[PDB]
């Protein structure tokens, strides 16, 4: 007897989406478009957005 590990029956994913609207100017940041240059500090293990230019597109492979 072995129960299902929870990863078997999902057939779905999760996603997230931050904010940079006047709700940040309502009352209180985590979604200012910081560049790549100033990012090496305590920003490791967080949620940060960065703008850029996408290069080196690989293909789609099954994991």
């Amino acid at each position: 007897t072995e129960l299902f590990p929870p990863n078997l029956t999902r057939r779905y994913f999760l996603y997230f989406k931050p904010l940079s609207q006047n709700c940040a100017r309502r009352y209180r940041i985590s979604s200012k478009p910081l560049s790549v240059r100033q990012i090496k500090g305590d920003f490791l293990g967080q949620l940060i957005t960065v703008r850029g230019i996408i290069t080196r597109v690989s293909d789609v492979k099954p994991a």
Binding site: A24, R25, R28, I29
Partner: protein, 59 residues
Amino acid sequence: PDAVFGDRVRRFQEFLDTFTSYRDSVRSIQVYNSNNAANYNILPHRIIISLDDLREFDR
């Protein structure tokens, strides 16, 4: 430790006068960094010890 720790502690009472002029400095640099971070709507921990405060009276 007593031999390798004793002149630590005797210095631990000694250099506290060698930041009479910096014990203001080390807290003034953070109190606004604590302030602005609470009202956003930034400096590292630099404690410049000069020679002069450690050569005039400790040999």
